């Protein structure tokens, strides 16, 4: 009911596999919910079809 103010905060991280050498950077982003307690690797989006 507060629209944007009821949307969950997202914790964003940059994962940077390098392989300990050179600038070969396997880079990808990870997102987590700010209040994750169980399954921080999952963002449960509840969809009413």
Partner 1 sequence: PSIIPFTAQAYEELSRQFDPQPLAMQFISQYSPEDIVTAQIEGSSGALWRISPPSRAQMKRELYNGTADITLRFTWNFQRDLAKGGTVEYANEKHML
State which of residues 5, 20, 22, 45 lies at the interface with partner 1 (CB under 8 A): 45
Q: Which stretch binds a second copy (CB under 8 A): 2-10, 11-19, 32-40?
A: 11-19
CB of 22 to partner 1, least distance (A): 14
Query: Residue 24 interacts with a second copy (CB under 8 A)?
Result: yes
Query: Which one of partner 1, a second copy, none is in contact with 22 (Cβ closer than 5 to 8 A by kind)?
Result: a second copy
| Of 15, 47, 12, 3, the residue nearest 33 (C-alpha) | 12
Cβ–Cβ < 8 Å for 26, 17: yes
Find all residues with CB under 8 Å of 43, minimum gap 6, and list them: 31, 32, 33
């Amino acid at each position: 009911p507060n629209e944007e103010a009821d949307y969950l905060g997202v914790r964003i991280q940059l994962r940077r596999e390098q392989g300990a050498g050179a600038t070969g950077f396997l880079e990808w982003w990870v997102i987590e919910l700010q209040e994750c307690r169980t399954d921080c690797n999952l963002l449960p989006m509840v969809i009413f079809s």
